[PDB]
Symmetry: none
């Protein structure tokens, strides 16, 4: 019933290189609806609870310090199976395994600077929604293409 | 030598989402000679003969009903392996399986709303050109860049 | 006045340099509904009545020949200020006078090869629509975002 | 001069016309830096307070109605001549007078649904951001091509 | 007049800002023929002589120093009025004065970093060709689409 | 490593199909810095040493004639995995098997007219850098964005 949302956010290196628009159009062109959208410097504490599962790895400190290094576009988006679909639309986390046509395969090159963050699962979707977003900031509304998008 | 000719009809949603230019641009910069075109409101009776292969299937009334909900560009392209090759350009029928870089993967989401159609084979194509288009609607010409596309 | 129509034609050189897609996209992305679309080589006979206003001009001999030399993407576009806005989108008659952002301004060099026509008036438009297309060829529907193009 | 700021908002017709990325893109591709960006349904008193200058207006109640009939994108952008120049990007108030290559010239037919609003002067700009944005939301950062934007 | 050439040089900031191809595509799509190209670092005795009209100006040193600070892509561009057309495609000397769709209006913001140079006269081009390019690096060929661009 | 340089040569069909701009702008958005870029109608004698290993093959001759039927744009792109990833940017040598979103995938149809050329190894890149270029043509500077594409 088209119920999934997925958190989508452009990392500093993409935003720093004028990619906020393209990534935004890419989802709009897929047939995805926006729910909430901002531009925040994620604080050291936030990125850490965000990357809580990556807390024990050696590359971890460099990841959040990079992730905190500048203001990020946080977003929610709406589609069916959006989490897997955004994940396909993003490509593989290492922009080397991702084919061109996917975003990271198109704009990034190295895994440390991979343009964006998209939720790995449903469990990840909701947690990343509760974390970056207040409940009221997710606006409910109808896209005008809806019936020509969904059956 | 005369080439394979596909039959590519852009669906009611495709025109309605305003990618006729985006779509025509693809078979174009690829190297294909469009040999026949018109924009029509496809008759239910006309549609029925198109999906005559399934006239026993249940969604059949909804398909004919939806395929008549908006206008169609009824197209004919030329090129070596244009039927399979256009299907290569299009992606798989279901857009979630469609690789970005394609028409279906780059622009839409849903299968009942997969933006455009193409004959699955020459045999299907050859029936599909003769049905939607009059023989004189098929423009016979040589492009000024035939020699640079073809050896 | 959303109901107003015009007539664009990509001329022989227009297809032959492979710019059909770029042209069609710009009219699409602006927010007009394509109503009728085809591809034809005009018989010198058809080119004549289109130019019957200049059948007595000095360049009528060349103008017919230039128009008959290639196939043509015959088009009917719909919506508010589609006549005036469309011609402006094409730019000046001479592409030497055509501005950046224009089809002739971005892609062409000579008035002898100005790549494209756009209805100079409603009078010419409606005559040009009736002249190229049957009514059973104009496909009347509604854009999913028309309510967002239109009040 | 370089730290001059301006207010631009896409109205309801824009967001519901899937133009959000395209409007952002012509500024970012222009090379103006994003300062603050949020998606909001502006309230009755708010919509009135922005047009408090138009309080004695017969099209006021309907303007309040439209500006509130859909979601809005309230944006901030920084750079030299960002106030004057941004207006040139949007085009003039009438979309029929907005020139090919401007936002309004490329994406709209009528003044009443003109997709985008721009600060008209420096004084107005600070008034339009100070009313619409909180102080902490206005982001301080530096684009990697600042030295390649500016002397 | 179809045989005219012009010198277009993408400036150090042009090289640095990821735009070399987009620049080439802009002449290429317009209808212009690449005559010659190289990627060099222009010497001080090169730039001073290139600009000997500006060798005595109060900004002469820092001018040569900037234009010497990064590599430049020297181009030679052929066609009917390629000099007069090319400057127009590029935009005005002042990118604050440069309009949408020009090289300077779309990418740059301030004159001291105006991304691109265009021959201002036939005399200046042939000086700008002979001083910048060797006799043999100037390619004589006919484009396969010349007949579709000219009469 | 980070410093690796690859060779790219754009085909005669490439200049002629109006694509050199699309080719370079693609490598630029990637994170790659242009180290060398030149243009020439190449001698048959050249096409000999680049294609020396095949000199006894029956398909050598038409090959030399084609790579000599038009001009060529020779490039040297810098970046991590420029040879390896860059090929994925081109697609498979046969544009027919090449996935759309790639270069030969987005524009070419038949392998005999395959638009561009990328190095196949570390070994060939260094020979091809030796062949198309004098050492003085290679330019040494820093892209203002390096610290953001890289760690």
């Amino acid at each position: 019933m088209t119920s999934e949302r997925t958190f989508i956010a452009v990392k500093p290196d993409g935003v720093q290189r004028c990619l906020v628009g393209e990534i935004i159009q890419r989802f709009e062109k897929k047939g995805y609806k926006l729910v909430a959208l901002k531009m925040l410097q994620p604080s050291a504490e936030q990125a850490q609870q965000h990357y809580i599962d990556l807390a024990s790895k050696p590359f971890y400190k460099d990841l959040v310090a990079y992730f905190s290094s500048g203001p990020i576009v946080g977003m929610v988006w709406e589609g069916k199976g959006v989490v897997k679909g955004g994940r396909v639309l993003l490509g593989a986390t290492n922009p080397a395994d991702s084919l061109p046509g996917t975003i990271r395969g198109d704009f990034a090159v190295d895994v440390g600077r991979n343009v964006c963050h998209g939720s790995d699962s449903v469990d990840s979707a909701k947690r990343e929604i509760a974390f970056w977003f207040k409940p009221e900031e997710l606006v409910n509304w109808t896209s005008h293409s809806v019936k020509q998008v969904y059956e």
